Design an enzyme around this catalytic site. Structure first.
Site, PDB file in Angstrom:
ATOM      1  CD  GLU A  11       5.809   6.976  54.906  1.00 45.28           C
ATOM      2  OE1 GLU A  11       5.639   7.570  53.819  1.00 45.28           O
ATOM      3  OE2 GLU A  11       6.816   6.279  55.149  1.00 45.28           O
ATOM      4  CG  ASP A  20      14.415   4.876  53.293  1.00 44.32           C
ATOM      5  OD1 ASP A  20      15.491   4.254  53.204  1.00 44.32           O
ATOM      6  OD2 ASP A  20      14.264   6.040  52.863  1.00 44.32           O
TER       7      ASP A  20
END
Ligand code: CL
Ligand code: CL
Length: 164
Positions: A11, A20
């Site tokens: 992440e 994202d």
């Protein structure tokens, strides 16, 4: 190595609202804020998830609080789902971190759809599970990360996350 250090790798860490992979407003250690196009609606969620007026930036301590709530939520989402709890039960401590890593990324519903893969993992047919897990959007859209998780399932080790 553990599930926390594992997901922190996939992440990353950014303290200002970002998009994202799929283009959705995100913050911190992979915390999806919303699937709305509007940045003002992203800010809103952020303020509501942290409890103050942020303006799109947060601290490292806060980023890690959402990370803890998120990892806790991924485990509890598994132990409540009739198709994920048995499999999680049948797996060792390394292959449990992998199943969490999935749930964390694409949600409990998304993982529970992987019906034929879940069965293989339950039958401890690892190589076969690894081949099935790769015939998916998850693998095409984010291939490097997916073949780290797939390797974990296939091997039962931390080899894919260790030379970093
Ligand atoms: Cl495919
Ligand atoms: Cl990737």
């Amino acid at each position: 190595m553990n599930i926390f250090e594992m997901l922190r790798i996939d992440e990353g860490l950014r303290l200002k609202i970002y998009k994202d992979t799929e283009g959705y407003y995100t913050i911190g250690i992979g915390h999806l804020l919303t699937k709305s196009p509007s940045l003002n609606a992203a800010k809103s969620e952020l303020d509501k998830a942290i409890g103050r007026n942020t303006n799109g930036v947060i601290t490292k301590d806060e980023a890690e609080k959402l990370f803890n709530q998120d990892v806790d939520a991924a485990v509890r989402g598994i132990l409540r789902n009739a198709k994920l709890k048995p499999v999680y039960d049948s797996l060792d401590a390394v292959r449990r971190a992998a199943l969490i890593n999935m749930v964390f990324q694409m949600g409990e519903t998304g993982v529970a759809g992987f019906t034929n893969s879940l069965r293989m993992l339950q039958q401890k047919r690892w190589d076969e599970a690894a081949v099935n897990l790769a015939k998916s959007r998850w693998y095409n859209q984010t291939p490097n990360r997916a073949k780290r998780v797939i390797t974990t399932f296939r091997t039962g080790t931390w080899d894919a996350y260790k030379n970093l």
